[PDB]
Amino acid sequence: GIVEQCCTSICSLYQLENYCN
Amino acid sequence: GIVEQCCTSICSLYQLENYCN
Amino acid sequence: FVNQHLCGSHLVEALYLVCGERGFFYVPA
Amino acid sequence: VNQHLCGSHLVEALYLVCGERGFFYVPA
């Protein structure tokens, strides 16, 4: 999920944006 | 530049942001 | 060395920015 | 799913994340 993607690892803008809505 | 960092390569949010102001 | 990781409030706050009008759902664990 | 921000997508990403600071874009 986003923590694994963006906190443990480094995430790109569109990976982040994918968690929107 | 922004093109080496974010297009050729993959930038983090903070790397992208660093190009603001 | 400078940290690229978004954790905690920093991640919420990124979400807040990139999602703008779309909103977002978030759960801190 | 593309990680890479290219071209007019890069300028759009900056539009977004810079908000009221705005930004300087140059391709070179």
Numbering used by the authors:
A (entry chain A), B (entry chain C): 1 to 21
C (entry chain B): 1 to 29
D (entry chain D): 2 to 29
From the paper:
Insulin is a small protein hormone composed of chain A (21 residues) and chain B (30 residues), and it exerts its biological effects by binding to the ~340 kDa tyrosine-kinase type insulin receptor (IR). To achieve the stabilization of a specific conformation of the hormone, we developed the strategy of inserting a covalent bridge between specific sites at the B24–B30 C-terminus of the insulin B-chain, i.e., an intramolecular side-chain:side-chain crosslinking. The evidence for the structural impact of the crosslinking in the analogues reported here comes from three crystal (analogues 2, 10, 11) and two NMR (analogues 8, 12) structures.
However, this shortening of the crosslinked sequence lowered the affinity of the resulting analogue 10 to 61%. Interestingly, the B27–B29 linker does not significantly affect the overall or local (e.g., B20–B26) insulin structures; the linker allows even the formation of typical insulin dimers with usual dimer-interface hydrogen bond patterns. However, in contrast to 2, the B24–B30 chain of analogue 10, when modeled on the B24 site of IR-bound insulin (not shown), can, somehow, be accommodated on the L1 surface, and its further reconfiguration will diminish clashes with the αCT-segment. Therefore, the shortening of the crosslinked sequence and its shift towards the very end of the B-chain in analogue 10 alleviates the conformational stress observed in 2, allowing likely a more effective contribution of the B24–B26 part of the B-chain towards its interaction with IR-A.
